[PDB]
Design a protein around this ligand. Structure first.
Ligand SMILES: C[C@@H](c1ccccc1)N1CN(c2ncc(Cl)c3ccncc23)n2ccc(=O)c(O)c2C1=O
Ligand SMILES: [Mg+2]
Ligand SMILES: [Mg+2]
Ligand code: NA
Ligand code: NA
Length: 349
DNA sequence: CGCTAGTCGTC
DNA sequence: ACGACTAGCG
């Protein structure tokens, strides 16, 4: 998530009820719901005991969207981007560290502090997501596992017009150019909608309301694909882009210290890391479910060599991507764990 | 004083 | 991993 973006653009937000989307399609960042579901049964999942509480939690939200006449499309995270492989294994280590600390606290009589530790010791596996997929498909709810980050797939579904809004706790969806994003939605259907159109209402932005300029601001402030330079937040990133009057973002970043009157010599790796973050937001691979084809989020522009963009997701045969998308092919082991076929029975029709 | 980043507390 | 919120910094 972009740190503190919701507050900076608070004027573009409005409180809504999901009733607003009766008769409309809405995609969900379902790993947000699986994580909260797995918190409610953290003590059992950590010890390896069998539990399907996280399934009922996601279904509580799905059935609520269906009650108000919304067609939900549950989107799941797929493979890890090459650049994020070192961080996800580091996260597995920190979860296994809290597994032993939670156990130690249960011995010391501190049951409530141990119950809190277990909530930060759970790995959301593709097996857990497949249980949710099977429960959602019984109720006739379409599910789509993204090839890589669900953030990019959700952005595709909205940009294509397949879905009119995205339900998520991640503000990166706005940096990805989503038209309507619904944050902080509770089990009853109440949440905050941020419309890209209403970014004009934000006096803090100035002219940093276009997709390209708004994306650059989020990257400069500190994004998932790149930490910011020290002392740069949304306010200072926003300031740099308003003052600069040059389309080449690279020349603006080299002269960043001049615009802010700050002592910042930008390193070699920050310029390239900015280009990679910008390329991941534009060209990260997604699955077109109607045509059943793996494609970049946006069609390649100007001189952008697709052979240099492996960090934004590697290509695989469309048949492999279809099997990942239907939840049949396990993300980690690439083993077929199911035989679902949409043609032998809709998002894929 | 505006802002950014480090500490306490929780889904 | 999320945000409240606060201190301390430029
Ligand atoms: C795979 C998916 C995912 C994994 C498990 C549970 C919840 C979410 N992630 C991973 N990651 C995470 N986001 C949120 C939470 Cl609460 C996480 C908890 C544990 N481990 C990773 C998390 N993350 C970070 C920054 C992002 O910009 C982002 O898009 C994701 C993201 O979607
Ligand atoms: Mg994500
Ligand atoms: Mg993200
Ligand atoms: Na920052
Ligand atoms: Na300008």
């Amino acid at each position: 998530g972009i740190q503190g973006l919701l507050q900076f653009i608070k004027e573009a937000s409005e409180p809504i009820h999901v009733r607003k989307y009766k008769g409309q399609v809405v995609a969900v960042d379902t790993y947000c719901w699986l994580h909260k579901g797995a918190i409610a049964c953290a003590e059992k999942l950590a010890k390896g005991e069998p539990t399907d509480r996280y399934v009922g939690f996601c279904m509580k939200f799905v059935n609520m969207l269906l009650s108000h006449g919304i067609k939900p499309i549950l989107v799941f995270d797929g493979c890890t981007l090459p650049s994020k492989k070192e961080v996800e294994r580091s996260r597995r280590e920190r979860r296994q560290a809290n597994l032993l600390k939670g156990k130690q606290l249960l011995r010391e009589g501190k049951v409530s502090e141990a119950r809190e530790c277990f909530t930060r010791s759970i790995n959301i596996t593709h097996a857990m997501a497949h249980k949710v997929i099977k429960a959602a498909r019984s109720q006739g709810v379409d599910c789509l596992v993204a090839p890589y980050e669900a953030d990019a797939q959700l952005a595709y579904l909205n940009k294509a017009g397949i879905v009119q809004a995205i339900i998520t706790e991640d503000s990166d969806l706005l940096a990805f150019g989503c038209k309507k994003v619904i944050l902080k939605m509770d089990q009853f259907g109440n949440g905050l909608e941020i419309d890209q159109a209403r970014l004009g209402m934000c006096r803090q932005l100035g002219d940093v309301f276009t997709e390209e300029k708004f994306r650059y601001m989020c990257i400069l402030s500190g994004c998932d694909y790149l930490s910011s330079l020290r002392g740069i937040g949304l306010a200072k990133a926003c300031k740099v882009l308003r003052l600069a009057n040059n389309p080449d973002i690279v020349k603006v970043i080299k002269k960043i210290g001049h615009y802010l009157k700050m002592n910042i010599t930008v390193p070699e790796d920050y310029i390239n890391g900015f280009i990679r973050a910008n390329n991941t937001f534009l060209y990260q691979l997604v699955f077109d479910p109607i045509k059943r084809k793996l494609i970049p989020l946006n069609a390649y522009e100007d001189d952008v060599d697709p052979e240099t963009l492996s960090y934004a997701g590697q290509y695989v045969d469309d048949s492999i991507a279809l099997q990942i998308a239907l939840g049949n092919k396990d993300i980690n082991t690439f083993e077929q764990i199911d035989d679902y076929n949409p043609d032998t029975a809709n998002l894929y029709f």
